RNA sequence: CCUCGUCAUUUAAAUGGUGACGCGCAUGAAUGGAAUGACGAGAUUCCCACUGUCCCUACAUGUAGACUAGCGAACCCAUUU
RNA sequence: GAGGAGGAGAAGGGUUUCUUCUCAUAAGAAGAGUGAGCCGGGUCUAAGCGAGUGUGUAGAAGCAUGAGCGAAGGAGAAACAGGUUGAUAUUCCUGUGCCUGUGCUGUCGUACGGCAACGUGUAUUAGCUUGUCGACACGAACAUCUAGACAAAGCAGAAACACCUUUUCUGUUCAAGGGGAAAAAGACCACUGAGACGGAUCAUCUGGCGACGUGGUUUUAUAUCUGUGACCAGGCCUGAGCCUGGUUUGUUGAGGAUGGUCGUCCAUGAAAAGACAACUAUAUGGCAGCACAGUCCGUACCAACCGUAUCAGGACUCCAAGGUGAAGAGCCUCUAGUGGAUGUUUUACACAUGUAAGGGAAUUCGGCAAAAUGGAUGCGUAACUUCGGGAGAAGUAUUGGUUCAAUUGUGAACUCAUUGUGACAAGGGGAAUCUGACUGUUUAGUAAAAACAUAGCUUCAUGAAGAGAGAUGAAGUGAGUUCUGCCCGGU
RNA sequence: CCUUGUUGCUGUGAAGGCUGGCGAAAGCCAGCUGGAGGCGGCAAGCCGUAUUGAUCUGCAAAUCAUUGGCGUAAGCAGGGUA
């Protein structure tokens, strides 16, 4: 047969375009700074708003981008790095923040610029500090617990734009605007409605799959469709998670 | 009623192709071209349009007298009277706190 | 105002889309269109520019917020925790 | 149409000078055996491909 | 950089070298002018508007034509207009600083 | 499948339609099952209005067609029919 | 019949355009014709392409970086009237101008005013830095201006006259550049000190972070004047020149322009070249006259384009009068443009159409085709339903001309030989069942659907990112309501 | 994907607002204002249901007539680019 939809959309001419982008998002590199928030802006592909910051490096003014936490305003002064106060919207070394606190834009290793929590409405929880090893345990929004060194930086607050998934998209055109900038195929034609030249689920005198939909992790790429390496299937209840800090 | 032709350029009704109808001394009704409108300066702090300055397109603005492009104050065009009053006060009041923190 | 018994702001849609879905949309649609109170000047002149960004029509201040309301439930609580940390 | 490039114009100018019959004096010359100029064209029957 | 140059107005491109011997007089007044045109079309222009019409070499430009006329014929020039015709000929029209002199120059030169 | 299943209603008359019944050759639950609203150039049955669809055809108009001037082809063809 | 069979541009064509001659004619031959500092190209940058260099390959492809390139409809210094040819004209000629630079001669300059909002003064180069202009979605209502269209009066010329008529028609012009209001809509400054209350919009709204009031400051059109006279109409003569007019008011009004408001979005709606202000230094700088300069390429014509053609097909745009009517609908007219295979009254069978006694689907697989209904105003409106709808449900009545009242609600009278949305335009309606929720999409050329899509629902995999779990990908079912039992033996 | 062009006439009357009445309250009933919608009837346009009409040595190697579907928008279109 021919090449399936899933492979074609991974070729280079289909990658997302950057022409409307504001810049690369991430923290400054300097040990200490005082910054001012210049503007709060929407960026074409992203639902969380961005804040433009201004800080001096040598004598010269320089500009950066952060993801906005909820409760900043244009004109606010913010303090970055060691010796910053625990005030909403400051950036601090993680070892300085008390247990049970909520944080965003956490660095996985020092000076990486911030990864981890970046989507609207999300946060992470500080669950443990180890005074020997200088590690800290953070609980991520998937439920995963990960350990990071005390020298990493983090932003104090919750990411702006929460609640967005409460309102249903009642019409086809509303879905159109949401997926127009994403990589997923919309509208999505079902594999059982294709001919066998186009998809492993195609063909036959009734619309059916005909073979089990759970497939191996090591299966060849042009036929790896369906539920890939599923441990279980169906709507029944699972089992207890195992937890360590 | 007499009807018009496009004398020059394209028929395609873009922003650069505005026209108006005019009556000539020879008693003809003809199309004649129109230049675009101009926006003048807005304040750098608040977005308000500055008083005392003209609105024109960049080339035409540069050919006017300097008096059309400024007011005679600390920031010429640039900022409005309220924003300069705030700036003058702020710089004064900050220096006095530093004076006190130096003396005490 | 209020010429309808149940349907409220969703009357624009006629008999299309499901009943249950419309009454979820309604909560958000009523919240989006209201004016709210400014923290800086006290007036009730704050409205939404775009998702996450709220703005005052008198004094011009812009502030980060939720998608359909200026302050979300998580924020109203967490703001208090910070005030205690400062003690 | 009215807008042309320099390269297109020279092609038209050359295509217009070549489009002529055999001059009437040549037919009288002892050694000359042509009847009609087979390179003559009509705008109704052929394209130049000047584009 | 190499490009097909299909939209260009000048068909030459290359910069020219020096040579061990150089051609005697160069592009010069007597290469520039070919002949003046005298017919019922041209006659009106001499009689009404004080302008002569001439055929000129393909390599010529407005500045060169102005000089060449003042060298060969001697009257002073106000304006030069140029026209590439469908017959492959470049025509120049020259208006003189004083009218009336157009009929003097035309008759001496045997154009008219 | 047997099958134009049996009983009721619609017609003068029902291999049709609707309502009931059910050991259902071989119905059935996201290979999705069941009951409605609004909307289909979607499939099907009936009633009112309306009529050359029909009983059963008649007359009239325009344009071609027949005959005439100018212009002027093709398919096909073992051919004695 | 002004959403033209009218007048023009682009893409495409390439002399098809103008004059003369000849039939050879959608045919030839011989000549002639396209003039720019101000119109467009040559400039800037979009999405993107890429020489060389590095890495790779037997040579290539590919991948990293990147000089140069990339829009005749995006950004982009400066021109308009009137004349003239057989054929060109914001390009030629006359008149009045403007932009960017250069040089001569005169003539002045090295600062002030207002409590303030800000003003007076045509002002040099250069540089940091901070900001502005270039520089921007859709939809709705309301103002103001300009084209356009009407109606009265005046004059000049036309049409019509068996009768009647101050009936009817055509005209009444003012460019770029220069000078310039009142008005309307917003900002702001000084005094003043307001509420269970005042102000204000068609609508929202607005005030001690300063209301109403009284005086000012500033931004944004247009009318009007000048543009030194051109141009038009008419009369008298004429192989040419003279003479007379071009005057007043009201109503309406964009399918063009502009202004400040309001709404929508899990959608927030380009860059760069080139400019300008403030701050800091530095100063022979401003204005008037006169003079000089501004290269190169395109410029005719199309009813002539693509379909083997002089082909009922296809093909990007601009301007647009009067009546009827809600209406650039249909029907009728003004401006401007238009047409040929010949004669014969011409049977039958056709193809486009009209009408029909009595009966009314008996016709046929099947009411297929046709008929019937039709606009506006009022009365009156069921089951069911997600409470929005169903709904124009169904069912009924009215409608012309004239002469009055009354002022938007409409009433009343008189009149006609079949009656009045008179032509043109203009829904048939109800009761049920199967099926897909809805608008949307599809087999260019035998299938438009119950098929595909869709919102919603459920499952799966991952902490890797220029992306970071309200995330990113893979499958299945098909809106909403109500349910979704049992089986891990085989694969 | 980048830069552009193209909405005329009418019906229904959501959210928000103002008056008057009723109520001890909460909030109910009238009339007016406002103008939402992949909402209705049409125009320019885009399409292709029926007559199994005309044509089938065609006007045409897919056209024509009447009749239909949508037409304030998951609508239609030129150029540049992949
Ligand atoms: K997508
Ligand atoms: K299929
Ligand atoms: K299958
Ligand atoms: K299935
Ligand atoms: K099976
Ligand atoms: K000023
Ligand atoms: K061309
Ligand atoms: K041709
Ligand atoms: K039976
Ligand atoms: K029966
Ligand atoms: K079964
Ligand atoms: K089954
Ligand atoms: K099941
Ligand atoms: K249908
Ligand atoms: K007949
Ligand atoms: K005949
Ligand atoms: K007519
Ligand atoms: K633009
Ligand atoms: K001149
Ligand atoms: K009159
Ligand atoms: K228009
Ligand atoms: K021309
Ligand atoms: K009309
Ligand atoms: K009317
Ligand atoms: K019209
Ligand atoms: K009309
Ligand atoms: K029947
Ligand atoms: K039958
Ligand atoms: K049939
Ligand atoms: K109920
Ligand atoms: K019904
Ligand atoms: K009626
Ligand atoms: K009719
Ligand atoms: K459907
Ligand atoms: K529709
Ligand atoms: K269909
Ligand atoms: K499944
Ligand atoms: K789905
Ligand atoms: K269900
Ligand atoms: K099993
Ligand atoms: K198993
Ligand atoms: K409406
Ligand atoms: K047929
Ligand atoms: K014909
Ligand atoms: Mg296969
Ligand atoms: Mg199925
Ligand atoms: Mg030229
Ligand atoms: Mg039957
Ligand atoms: Mg049954
Ligand atoms: Mg089944
Ligand atoms: Mg018309
Ligand atoms: Mg027409
Ligand atoms: Mg000719
Ligand atoms: Mg120009
Ligand atoms: Mg370029
Ligand atoms: Mg342009
Ligand atoms: Mg011409
Ligand atoms: Mg001008
Ligand atoms: Mg021309
Ligand atoms: Mg009958
Ligand atoms: Mg009868
Ligand atoms: Mg029978
Ligand atoms: Mg029918
Ligand atoms: Mg049923
Ligand atoms: Mg549909
Ligand atoms: Mg087909
Ligand atoms: Mg079909
Ligand atoms: Mg389906
Ligand atoms: Mg469901
Ligand atoms: Mg339930
Ligand atoms: Mg509109
Ligand atoms: Mg609609
Ligand atoms: Mg039509
Ligand atoms: Mg189609
Ligand atoms: Mg059929
Ligand atoms: Zn300001
Ligand atoms: Zn405020």
Q: What is the DSSP string of B44-75?
A: SSS-PBPTT-----HHHHHTS-GGGS--SSSS
Contact residues for B76 (Cβ-Cβ < 8 A; gap 6+): B69, B70
Contact A35, A13 (CB under 8 A): no
User: 3-state secondary structure string, chain A?
Assistant: CCCCHHHHCCCHHHCCCCCCCCCCCCCCCCCEEEEEEEEEEEECCEEEEEEEEEEEECCEEEEEEEECECCCECCCEEEEECCCCCCCCCEEEHHHCCCCCEEECCCCCCCCCCCCCCCCCCCEEEEEECCCCCEEEEECCCCCEEEEECCCEEECCCECCCCHHHCCCCCHHHHHHHHCCCCCCCCCCCHHHCCCCCCCCCCCCCCCCCCCCEECCCCCHHHCCCEECCCCCCCCCCCCCCCCC
Q: Would you state the structure tokens that stand for residue D23, as one six-digit string? A: 């001059």
Q: Output phi, psi for B90, to 5 deg.
A: -60, -45
Residues of chain D neighbouring E7 (CB-CB closer than 8 A): 5
A15-to-A43, A180, A183, A224, B23 alpha-carbon distances in Å: 18, 13, 7, 21, 57
Q: Which of E11, E84, E86 sits opposite D16 (nearest CB)?
A: E86
Q: Which of C50, C68, C81 sits opposite A163 (nearest CB)?
A: C68
Cα B70 to Cα E73: distance, rounded to the nearest angstrom: 58
Nearest CA in chain A to C52: A161
Cα C28 to Cα A168: distance, rounded to the nearest angstrom: 10
Look-up of token digits 């350029």: B9
Q: Which of A47, A164, A168 sits opposite C25 (nearest CB)?
A: A168
SS3 assignment, position C42: coil
Which bases of chain H are contacted by protein, using any atom under 7 A from a CB?
1-2, 4-6, 13-18, 28, 36-39, 73-74, 82
Long-range interactions of A129-135: CB distance < 8 A, separation 24+: A129/A95, A129/A99, A134/A95
Cα A67 to Cα A22: distance, rounded to the nearest angstrom: 12
How many CB pairs below 8 A link A and C?
100
Contact E16, E86 (CB under 8 A): no
Nucleotide nearest to C14 (CA to C1'): G388
Residue A97 touches partner C, C-beta closer than 8 Å:
no
Q: Output phi, psi for A174, to 5 deg.
A: -75, -30
B52-to-B55, B73, B77, B79, B91 alpha-carbon distances in Å: 10, 12, 8, 12, 26
The alpha carbon dihedral of C8, C11, C13, C17 has a sign of: positive
Contact residues for B83 (Cβ-Cβ < 8 A; gap 6+): B43, B44, B45, B46
Angle between helices E40-48 and E101-108 (to 10 degrees): 140
Cis before A187 (ω within 30)? yes
Measure the CA angle with vertex A15, ends A11 and A16; round to 5°.
165
Look-up of token digits 């990493």: A152
Within 10 Å of residue A158's Cβ, how many Cβ atoms? 26
Cα B99 to Cα C84: distance, rounded to the nearest angstrom: 33
Look-up of token digits 């127009």: A180
Cα A125 to Cα C81: distance, rounded to the nearest angstrom: 14
Nearest CA in chain C to A67: C64
Cα A176 to Cα D2: distance, rounded to the nearest angstrom: 45
Cα C7 to Cα D10: distance, rounded to the nearest angstrom: 75
Paired residues of A153 in beta bridges: A93
Within 10 Å of residue A182's Cβ, how many Cβ atoms? 10
**Which ligand sits closest to the CA of C20?**
70
Within 10 Å of residue A33's Cβ, how many Cβ atoms? 20
Contact D9, D51 (CB under 8 A): no
Element (H, E) at E63: helix E62-72
Q: Output phi, psi for A51, to 5 deg.
A: -115, 130
Measure the CA angle with vertex A152, ends A85 and C76; round to 5°.
50
Cα B19 to Cα A10: distance, rounded to the nearest angstrom: 50
Paired residues of C50 in beta bridges: C53
Protein CA at C14 to nucleotide C1' at G383, angstroms: 21
Look-up of token digits 């490009």: E3
User: For residues E51-76, b (16+ Cβ closer than 10 Å) or e, as one string?
Assistant: bbbbebeeebeeebbbebbeeebeee
Helices (H) and strands (E) in chain C, counts: 2, 3
Cα A219 to Cα A202: distance, rounded to the nearest angstrom: 19
Measure the CA angle with vertex E23, ends E20 and E25; round to 5°.
140
User: Torsion angle, CA of B53/B56/B60/B65, rounded to 10 degrees?
Assistant: -10
Cα B24 to Cα B52: distance, rounded to the nearest angstrom: 37
Q: Would you state the structure tokens that stand for residue E83, as one six-digit string? A: 């026209």
Candidates E12, E58, E84, E89: best to mutate against D (most CBs of D within 10 A) is E84
Contact A138, A124 (CB under 8 A): yes
Cα D19 to Cα D37: distance, rounded to the nearest angstrom: 9
Cα D41 to Cα D39: distance, rounded to the nearest angstrom: 6
Measure the CA angle with vertex A81, ends C84 and A139; round to 5°.
60
Cα E25 to Cα A125: distance, rounded to the nearest angstrom: 91
Nearest to E60 by CA among E15, E30, E40: E30
Q: Would you state the structure tokens that stand for residue C38, as one six-digit string? A: 């400014």
Cα A215 to Cα A224: distance, rounded to the nearest angstrom: 7
E88-to-A213, C36, C75 alpha-carbon distances in Å: 77, 78, 82
Strands (E), chain C: 46-50, 53-56, 62-64
Cα B94 to Cα B84: distance, rounded to the nearest angstrom: 16
Paired residues of E2 in beta bridges: none
Contact A37, A73 (CB under 8 A): yes
SS3 assignment, position B22: strand
Interface contact flag, E6 D5, Cβ < 8 Å:
yes
The alpha carbon dihedral of C31, C35, C39, C40 has a sign of: positive
CA C57, distance to chain mean position in Å, is 16
Measure the CA angle with vertex A50, ends A153 and C75; round to 5°.
70
The alpha carbon dihedral of A65, A67, A73, A76 has a sign of: negative
Contact B83, B46 (CB under 8 A): yes
Cα C59 to Cα C63: distance, rounded to the nearest angstrom: 12
Nearest to C24 by CA among C37, C13, C40, C36: C13
DSSP state of E72: H
Look-up of token digits 């001012």: A36
Contact A159, A70 (CB under 8 A): yes
Q: Would you state the structure tokens that stand for residue E45, as one six-digit string? A: 């222009």
Interface contact flag, A74 C62, Cβ < 8 Å:
yes
SS3 assignment, position D46: coil
Instruction: For D1-20, give the DSSP string.
Output: -----HHHHHHHHHHHHS--
Resolution limit in angstroms? 2.8
């Amino acid at each position: 047969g021919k090449v399936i939809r899933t492979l074609r959309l991974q070729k280079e001419h289909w990658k997302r375009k950057h022409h409307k982008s504001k810049g690369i998002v991430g923290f400054p590199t300097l040990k200490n700074c005082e910054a001012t928030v210049e503007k709060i802006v929407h960026e074409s592909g992203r639902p969380a708003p961005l804040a433009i910051i201004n800080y001096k490096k040598e004598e010269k003014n320089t500009k950066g981008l952060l993801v906005a936490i909820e409760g900043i305003y244009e004109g606010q002064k913010i303090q970055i790095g060691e010796n910053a106060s625990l005030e909403l919207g400051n950036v601090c070394p993680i070892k300085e923040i008390p247990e049970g606190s909520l944080v965003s834009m956490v660095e996985k290793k020092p000076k990486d610029g911030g990864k981890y929590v970046k989507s609207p409405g999300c946060y992470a929880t500080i669950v443990y500090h180890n005074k020997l090893t200088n590690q800290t345990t953070i609980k991520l929004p998937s439920g995963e617990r990960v350990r990071v060194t005390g020298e990493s930086r983090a932003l104090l607050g919750i990411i702006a734009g929460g609640g967005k998934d409460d309102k249903p998209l009642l019409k086809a055109v509303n879905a159109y605007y949401k997926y127009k900038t994403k990589g997923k195929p919309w509208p999505r034609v079902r594999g059982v409605a294709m001919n066998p030249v186009d998809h492993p689920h195609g063909g036959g005198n009734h619309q059916h799959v005909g073979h089990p939909t759970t497939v191996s992790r090591n299966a060849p790429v042009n036929g790896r469709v369906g539920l890939v390496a599923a441990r279980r299937t169906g709507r029944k209840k699972g089992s207890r998670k195992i937890t360590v800090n | 009623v007499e009807r018009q032709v496009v004398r020059r350029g394209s028929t395609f009704n873009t922003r650069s192709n505005k026209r108006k109808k005019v009556r000539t001394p020879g008693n003809r009704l003809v199309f004649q071209d129109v230049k675009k409108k101009g926006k003048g300066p807005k304040c750098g702090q608040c977005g308000i349009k500055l008083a005392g300055v003209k609105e024109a397109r960049p080339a035409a603005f540069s050919r006017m007298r300097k008096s059309c492009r400024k007011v005679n104050r600390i920031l010429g065009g640039v900022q409005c009277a309220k924003c300069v009053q705030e700036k003058v006060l702020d710089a004064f009041l900050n220096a006095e706190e530093k004076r006190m923190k130096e003396l005490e | 105002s209020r010429k309808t018994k149940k349907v409220g702001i969703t009357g624009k849609y006629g008999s299309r889309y499901g009943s249950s879905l419309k009454r979820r949309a309604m909560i958000c649609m009523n919240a989006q269109s209201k004016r709210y109170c400014c923290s800086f000047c006290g007036k009730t002149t704050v409205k939404r520019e775009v998702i996450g960004i709220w703005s005052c029509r008198f004094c011009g201040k812009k502030v980060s917020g939720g998608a359909y309301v200026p302050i979300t439930n998580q924020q109203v609580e967490y703001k208090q925790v910070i005030n205690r940390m400062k003690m | 149409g009215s807008i042309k490039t320099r390269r297109i114009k020279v092609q038209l100018v050359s295509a217009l000078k070549k489009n002529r019959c055999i001059p009437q004096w040549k037919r009288a010359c002892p050694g000359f055996k042509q009847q009609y100029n087979f390179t003559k064209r009509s705008w109704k029957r052929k394209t130049l491909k000047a584009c | 950089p190499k490009l097909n140059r299909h939209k260009a107005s000048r068909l030459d491109k290359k910069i020219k070298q020096k040579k061990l011997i150089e051609k005697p007089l160069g592009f010069s007044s007597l290469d520039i002018i070919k002949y003046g045109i005298g017919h019922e079309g041209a006659a009106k222009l001499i009689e009404e508007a004080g302008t002569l019409t001439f055929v000129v070499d393909q390599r010529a430009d407005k500045i060169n034509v102005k000089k060449a006329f003042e060298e060969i014929y001697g009257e002073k020039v106000k304006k030069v207009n140029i026209n590439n015709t469908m017959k492959g000929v470049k025509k120049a029209y020259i208006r003189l600083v004083e009218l009336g002199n157009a009929a003097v120059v035309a008759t001496k030169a045997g154009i008219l």
